[PDB]
């Protein structure tokens, strides 16, 4: 037994008693803030939140007296790793206050930075209203190129200096926690150590991501070539039919999701998509029936009822009056059998689907309620939002909709509607996987020093032409920080959790449709009325983090690593259809074409032949004098030939 083990076990027993009653108070005070926005309620959760944040730092230093080399129990050892990790407490005193100032500066530049119109400089647009609605709605080439560039440049410069400092620091925090760099710190969520054949290194994730990406690359090239052909009809004389796509024409500000190109790229535009938003009005479905239809969806597969206090304590419907609340759809795990759902539910199709999505998190949280407190989470960072998306995937099928009451029973779906559905999925699912892969591959190489600080923006657009297939419309030097203009980069968030969530989502779906004895294609599958499929899901749901995630995958899919063949079986009716539409077109892209390339003038300077000795060095100050000499030459030509006064600068 060894005293050590006993001591640890006890310490954890007295810990979980005093953690559960104290975390319940910090969560209920935050629930009362978000349903009831009062400035009384702001510091109601801030003194209760700091009672929690200080309680962890007391109990972290008490857990250092139990080293890990002698603990034989794995449940006890797993809670000690979550509690002994130092975090940002390992830094200096003035460096830990310097790091929190940089993080608060970058998140304030992102949310409060604005962009002003050039011809009317009194109207300035923030990002989240106004500048996002330009890139999502406009079809004008010059208005999309303006927003992009502008926002880019500004936020760029800002996040630049701060970003550099931050990168420099976060590495010291990771190396003092016995990691190689900060990229190795982020991959520690997937690390499994010594569970007798279920192990997983932190460097095996880079190999498993690059191996599974090379099988998406045939499907992505046919989707990239089909979008390029349909974009040439909306922007003629702007997109080369063998080159990359311009970065500002991709549906939003960064090109993360291609879902706003559906109105330009729809394969059969005359056939409308399956929408049940009007039959829910004609059957008078309020924001209690669709949660009762969602609850009976889960009891059909064998998952239990709701917890009988879920209906009383909830926020299923908006107040509407002066009583204010925040409407982001979240599931809550307050503690001691308290599970609450907060969303202002409309009567629409997607709020019927988001009700199935958010109740997937509640059925996940209701399963591992018997676990210890530190093991009440997903098996890694991808499992949580993957279970919540296979619930909305099955609930949006027309086989499920026609048996719930909507979608009148003499309704045969067309095989042109299924291609209209599969392309709207592939613009969001497949269209984000080369963006998610390239961004984490750029950040992993910056953190470990494989990319020097004078080649950050050279390697960013070299990787976008090669991996993503997206070209910049304006050349960006090392004064910009275009990756930091995304929310997850400047607010310190791990981005690999969106790649692995996409791969687990279809691995879970294919493993559940075989249990439910599904016959047709994968994208028409339902898991409802199948108890033997809910049994395969609940055996992973009840684990939490008590078992490794490689063992949690084998409880569902029968494998130990993440696989990409279930993703390609989902988009198999689309992939055969895309190979027929790209018979004449060119599949692939060349990384040499550029939107500014046919108007460029190449300058070649040979300094040591005109001077030899007494020849000056060509630094960045000489490039400033060249740009002012060309700007002088353009000013004289427009005055002496065209009689116009155009003030060209060196920034033009």
């Amino acid at each position, epitope marked *: 037994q060894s005293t050590i083990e*006993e001591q640890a076990k006890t310490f954890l027993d007295k810990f979980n008693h005093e953690a559960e009653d104290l975390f319940y108070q910090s969560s209920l005070a935050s629930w009362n803030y978000n349903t009831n926005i009062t400035e009384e309620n702001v510091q109601n959760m801030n003194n209760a939140g700091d009672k929690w944040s200080a309680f962890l730092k007391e109990q972290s230093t*008490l857990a250092q007296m139990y080293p890990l080399q002698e603990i034989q129990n794995l449940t006890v050892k797993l809670q000690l790793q979550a509690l002994q990790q130092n975090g940002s407490s390992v830094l200096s005193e003035d460096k830990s206050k310097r790091l929190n100032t940089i993080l608060n500066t970058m998140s304030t530049i992102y949310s409060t930075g604005k962009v002003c119109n050039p011809d009317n400089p009194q109207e300035c647009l923030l990002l989240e209203p106004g500048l996002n609605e330009i890139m999502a709605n406009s079809l004008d080439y010059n208005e999309r190129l303006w927003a992009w560039e502008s926002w880019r440049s500004e936020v760029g410069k800002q996040l630049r200096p701060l970003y550099e400092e931050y990168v420099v620091l976060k590495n010291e925090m990771a190396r003092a926690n016995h990691y190689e760099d900060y990229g190795d710190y982020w991959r520690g969520d997937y690390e499994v150590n010594g569970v007798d054949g279920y192990d997983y290194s932190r460097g095996q994730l880079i190999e498993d991501v690059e191996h599974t990406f090379e099988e998406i690359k045939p499907l992505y090239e046919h989707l990239h070539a089909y979008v390029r052909a349909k974009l040439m009809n909306a922007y003629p004389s702007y997109i080369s039919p063998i080159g990359c796509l311009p970065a500002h024409l991709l549906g939003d500000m960064w090109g993360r999701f291609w879902t706003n190109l559906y109105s330009l790229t729809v394969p059969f535009g005359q056939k409308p998509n399956i929408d049940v938003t009007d039959a829910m009005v004609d059957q008078a479905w309020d924001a209690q029936r669709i949660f009762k239809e969602a609850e009976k969806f889960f009891v059909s597969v064998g998952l239990p009822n709701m917890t009988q206090g879920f209906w009383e304590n909830s926020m299923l419907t908006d107040p509407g009056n002066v009583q204010k609340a925040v409407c982001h759809p979240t599931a809550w795990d307050l503690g001691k059998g308290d599970f609450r759902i907060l969303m202002c539910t409309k009567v629409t199709m997607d709020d019927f689907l988001t009700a199935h999505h958010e109740m997937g998190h509640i059925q996940y949280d209701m399963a591992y309620a018997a676990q210890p407190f530190l093991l009440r989470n997903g098996a890694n960072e991808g499992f949580h939002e993957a279970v919540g998306e296979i619930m909305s995937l099955s609930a949006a099928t027309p086989k499920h909709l026609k048996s719930i009451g909507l979608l009148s029973p003499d309704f045969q779906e067309d095989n042109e509607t299924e291609i209209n559905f599969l392309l709207k999925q592939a613009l969001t699912i497949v269209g984000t996987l080369p963006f998610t892969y390239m961004l984490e591959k750029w950040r992993w190489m910056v953190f470990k020093g494989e990319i020097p600080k004078d080649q950050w923006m050279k390697k960013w657009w070299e990787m976008k032409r090669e991996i993503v297939g997206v070209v910049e419309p304006v050349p960006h030097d090392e004064t910009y920080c275009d990756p930091a203009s995304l929310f997850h980069v400047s607010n310190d968030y791990s981005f690999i959790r969106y790649y692995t969530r996409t791969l687990y989502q279809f691995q879970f779906q294919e493993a559940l449709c075989q249990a439910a004895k599904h016959e047709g294609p994968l994208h028409k599958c339902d898991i409802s009325n199948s108890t033997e499929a809910g049994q395969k899901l609940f055996n992973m749901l009840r684990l939490g983090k008590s078992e490794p995630w490689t063992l949690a995958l084998e409880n569902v899919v029968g494998a130990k690593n993440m696989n990409v063949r279930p993703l390609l079986n989902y988009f198999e009716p689309l992939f055969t259809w895309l190979k027929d539409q790209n018979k004449n077109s060119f599949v692939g892209w060349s990384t040499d074409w550029s939107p500014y390339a046919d108007q460029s003038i190449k300058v070649r300077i040979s300094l040591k032949s005109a001077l030899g000795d007494k020849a000056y060095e060509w630094n960045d100050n000489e490039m400033y004098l060249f740009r002012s000499s060309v700007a002088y030459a353009m000013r004289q030509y427009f005055l002496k030939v065209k009689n116009q006064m155009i003030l060209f600068g060196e920034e033009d």
Partner: antibody
Amino acid sequence: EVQLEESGAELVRPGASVKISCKAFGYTFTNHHINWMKQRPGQGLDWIGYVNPYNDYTKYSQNFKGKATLSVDRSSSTAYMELSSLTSEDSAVYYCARWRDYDRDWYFDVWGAGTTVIVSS
Amino acid sequence: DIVMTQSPATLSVTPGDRVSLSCRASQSIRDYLYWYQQKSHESPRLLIKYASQSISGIPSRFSGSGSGSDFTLSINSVEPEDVGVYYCQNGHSFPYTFGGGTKLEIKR
């Protein structure tokens, strides 16, 4: 100051059950495990087990499982040791001792004075 | 479980003498023994925290040494009132089996 209090030099008829009480003083209480040891006269010590006052959790050595039970009253700061099926062999000085901390340092600090338990009719 | 043995069994050393008392281990007890001084008709006290660290309130000359499986309680120029049965406790295994015992007599 920190003391532990014992109770009774109990003479019991063999075959019956006994009640050994250890009263606390000074330190809090529900913040230090309470152990028990047996010492035969003219012999070395050996271990009975312990009762955690928090969580009422007990642990025993293998020679005493099913022989003695351990209880505790949080409202009165008394710990109980109760042996049952008393033979002629369980005739020794019984010490109640705590160790400090709760999970940190697992070595004894302060002791009782021993309750002499004699088994004879 | 672990059998804790004491290398002497009885000493009768005169005062003013530097002595050494050894508890040998059984398996691998990594610096987790504790030395106990028990006088006659009393409750034992503490002598050594883990292997050489001392409890405040003890007089001087009480020092432990060694680790792993060999330990030595060292008394230097003993007192006339340093009599009693000097035990050694265990760490690792839960059933902390108390050592044998080493009585301390005097006279020459």
